[PDB]
A paper describes a structure:
Biliverdin Reductase B (BLVRB) is an NADPH-dependent reductase that catalyzes the reduction of multiple substrates and is therefore considered a critical cellular redox regulator. However, it was later discovered that BLVRB is identical to flavin reductase (FR) that is a promiscuous enzyme responsible for reduction of flavin substrates, which includes flavin adenine dinucleotide (FAD) and flavin mononucleotide (FMN).
At the cofactor binding site, three arginines show clear remodeling compared to the holo state. To determine if this defined conformation of the R78-loop is an artifact of cooling to cryogenic temperatures, the complementary room-temperature (20 °C) structure was compared. One important difference between the apo BLVRB structures was that the apo-cryo structure exhibited a defined density of the R78-loop that would block coenzyme entry and release, while this region was disordered in the apo-RT structure that would facilitate such an interaction. Elsewhere, both apo structures are generally similar, but there are significant regions throughout the enzyme which differ when comparing the apo-structures and the previously determined holo-structure (0.8 Å all-atom RMSD). Specifically, loops 34–46, 115–126, and 153–176 show large displacements and conformational changes with some regions having greater than a 2 Å Cα RMSD.
Author numbering: 2 to 206
Write the structure that this text describes.
């Protein structure tokens, strides 16, 4: 089964709770971060910290080596400018997975990849363009890839009670960051979402 995982993006909002939940679940977790002090110094903490940059192939290789599976939660530090930082990070992650024979990757993009393109808000088009590039990298890799395409990510407490919609939009437009992290981890325990797009969502009121 899956026992050793790498998490990319662990210092972001969904990343931090995914990381805590992964450690609590008993995974042996490796993270790649720019600064180890961005991780909590108390509570559940990962087994291995690599300090480096997801845009550097060798730093990513050190992080993927020896893993059973990879979680990808890269973002743009809330910058909406045209960018390739997510897709280029994913390119490095896939390259290292291929070199080491790691097959399983669970990666977050956004529900806008399931929208009619004519309805994506223009202000979010540049970030969505790079999510599309990232999804292409992962789909073309031939790895076992679960495409997680969440709607708006909220701060509601963990429920574990959300809906998972396959290959289409789901009936709520929000998912808590805690439920999203919970779902990321669920995708490590099953192959049934491999090659599919998944949309987690929930009604919190
Ligand atoms: Na970081
Ligand atoms: Na759903």
């Amino acid at each position: 089964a899956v026992k050793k995982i790498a998490i990319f993006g662990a210092t972001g909002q969904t990343g931090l709770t995914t990381l805590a939940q992964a450690v609590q679940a008993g995974y042996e977790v490796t993270v790649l971060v720019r600064d180890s002090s961005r991780l909590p110094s108390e509570g559940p903490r990962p087994a291995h910290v690599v300090v480096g940059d997801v845009l550097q192939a060798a730093d990513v290789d050190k992080t993927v080596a020896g893993q059973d599976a990879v979680i990808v939660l890269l973002g743009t530090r809330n910058d909406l400018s045209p960018t390739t930082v997510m897709s280029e990070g994913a390119r490095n992650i896939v390259a290292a997975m291929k070199a080491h024979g790691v097959d399983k990757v669970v990666a977050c993009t956004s529900a806008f990849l399931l929208w009619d393109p004519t309805k994506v808000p223009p202000r979010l088009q540049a970030v969505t363009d790079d999510h599309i590039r990232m999804h292409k990298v992962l789909r073309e890799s031939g790895l076992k890839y679960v495409a997680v395409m969440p709607p708006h990510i909220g701060d509601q407490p963990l429920t574990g009670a959300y809906t998972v919609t396959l290959d289409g939009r789901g009936p709520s437009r929000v998912i808590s960051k805690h439920d999203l992290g919970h779902f990321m981890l669920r995708c490590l325990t099953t192959d049934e979402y491999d090659g599919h797009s998944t949309y987690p969502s929930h009604q919190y009121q």
